[PDB]
Amino acid sequence: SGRLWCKAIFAGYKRGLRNQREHTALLKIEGVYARDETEFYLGKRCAYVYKAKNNTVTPGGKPNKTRVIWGKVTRAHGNSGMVRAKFRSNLPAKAIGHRIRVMLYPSRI
Template sequence: MSNSTRLYTKGLILGYKRGLRNQHTNTSLIRIEGVNNKNETEFYLGKRVAYIYRAQKKTKATLRKTRNASKFRVMWGKVTRSHGNSGVVRAKFRHNLPPKSMGATVHVMLYPSRV
């Protein structure tokens, strides 16, 4: 029997930060599972966020004839602050998330810790 520890919690991409007329694509809004108010978001500030998606082609590892080639790719980001009072957080990704990612799930990692 293995003792596995959980390294992430699920999140949902809601969209970009926006006003009435303009949207700011450099900041994404994420709802974290089990977080329902502004006080509960405090734990997640500074945590890493991974958007995992599947591409058509395998990675370039196939060109080097290695076995660990995969069609899965990851876009990394970081939770920056809370957004509103209902437990939604803002996250900035190294590369802006594509519009196709809206409604998709993300992994909100439980590291790094802010002790």
Template sequence: MHTFWYFRKEAKDIFDNSTTTHEFISIAQEIHSRCLQKLVTASMSRIRSDTNIHRGRHLSYQRGKRNTNPGTSLIKIEGVDDTKAANFYLGKKVAFVYRAQREVRGSKIRVIWGKVTRPHGNSGVVRAQFRRNLPPKSFGASVRVMLYPSSI
């Protein structure tokens, strides 16, 4: 939308200063291509370079009516809305990245790794088991779902 406004503004300036219609058309086409190029480069800069990562949310532990099972976490992956799509992620690595207070080996950033074990229900939620159980503080927190190991 903003690109079109920019194009109109530049075209108006050229129209006021151009002598022939042919000259106006050729200059307007050049401006239009420049505007499209700006739009494409702006949208490309917003695309993540690491496309082998999908985002997800830690919903809860697997649970029944009364008992929770902290060994298995429920993960909702963005854009996954059914069991068929969730089956693609079986076996994929999941990383819960968090920041700790104390520095260890030169970094305060820590990771708990896990993997997707099976779908949970019909709405695209998956179950994942982590090397160490995720803390309850992570409910609602973001996790990274890696697209490896790949079976394609």
């Protein structure tokens, strides 16, 4: 009867001014605003959810549009709320400024 994931926004690759690295992303988890705050989120599963023209089969459903890229939160980044990531499938840059779900499951409570 509701949601079971936390909202966040892909906000560029890991990089310094003039050479970009594509094997690490950079998420802005919602309402989390220092380092202190970001222990929880470490290791915890994450998902980019999307929708191609043709039918992909699923597990636990019918063969339909919807697909995912899967990944993993690794460590904190900076001073201010941010977080790094490592999906198995390297992300599109379409998704810059679009939604991703961090889950709650591999919990440590």
